[PDB]
């Protein structure tokens, strides 16, 4: 635009909508209010453990878990790895990162953490997927 049009109407940049919104909100049990926190991870309770069919191009039974976080927020989280020991009423640690196939899963359950075991036979890539150094 012209300089005068810019002076009257300064340029407005676009706002950035962030992924993993449920990690950006805290809770205050005393005031019954939601806060803004920007947490790396959040801890929740598994209210449902099951398996989800993936998007159309792919075909594989993917394990997931419905997790109610520390907030009053109920999200769906992926379970990386082969074997998992999670049933209902399991405390998990949930990080960011979505699954492309699974529609409605925007988070990942951290393996090898509070009440979540690692992958039994993992030998290369043990930082991810939990599990300690064999021998």
């Amino acid at each position: 635009p012209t300089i005068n049009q810019l002076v009257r109407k300064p340029r407005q940049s676009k706002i950035k909508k962030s992924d993993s919104p449920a990690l950006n909100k805290g809770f205050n049990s005393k005031k019954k209010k939601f806060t803004d926190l920007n947490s790396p991870q959040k801890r929740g309770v598994c209210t449902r453990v099951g398996t989800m069919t993936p998007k159309k191009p792919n075909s594989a039974l993917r394990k997931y878990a419905r997790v109610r976080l520390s907030n009053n927020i109920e999200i769906n989280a992926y379970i990386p790895g082969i074997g998992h020991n999670l049933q209902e009423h399991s405390v998990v640690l949930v990080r960011g990162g979505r699954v492309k196939d699974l529609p409605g899963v925007r988070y990942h359950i951290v393996r090898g953490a509070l009440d979540t075991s690692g992958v039994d036979g993992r030998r290369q890539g043990r930082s991810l997927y939990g599990t300690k150094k064999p021998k």
Binding site: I3, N4, L6, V7, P10
Partner: protein, 80 residues
């Protein structure tokens, strides 16, 4: 020392011993650099209210008079 002086235009003389002086100045835009005209209204004291709406007058600051006035009328130069 020295108290600041402004020159403006009388835009209100509906109150006794008080006039409103419009001191228009210039402020450049920080980003685009264009100078934009902006105006500021000053409420000034004049015991003998000889200023009439439309006069360019001389204004000098002083101690607080009333809730808003901080200026006195120094010189009237226009007639309108």
């Amino acid at each position: 020392n020295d108290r600041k002086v402004y020159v403006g235009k009388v835009v209100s003389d509906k109150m006794d011993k008080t006039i409103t002086v419009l001191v228009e100045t210039y402020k450049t835009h920080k980003l685009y650099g264009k100078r934009v005209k902006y105006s500021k209204k000053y409420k000034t004291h004049d015991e003998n209210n000889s200023a009439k709406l439309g006069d360019i007058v001389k204004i000098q600051e002083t101690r607080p008079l009333s809730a808003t006035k901080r200026f006195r009328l120094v010189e009237i130069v226009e007639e309108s």
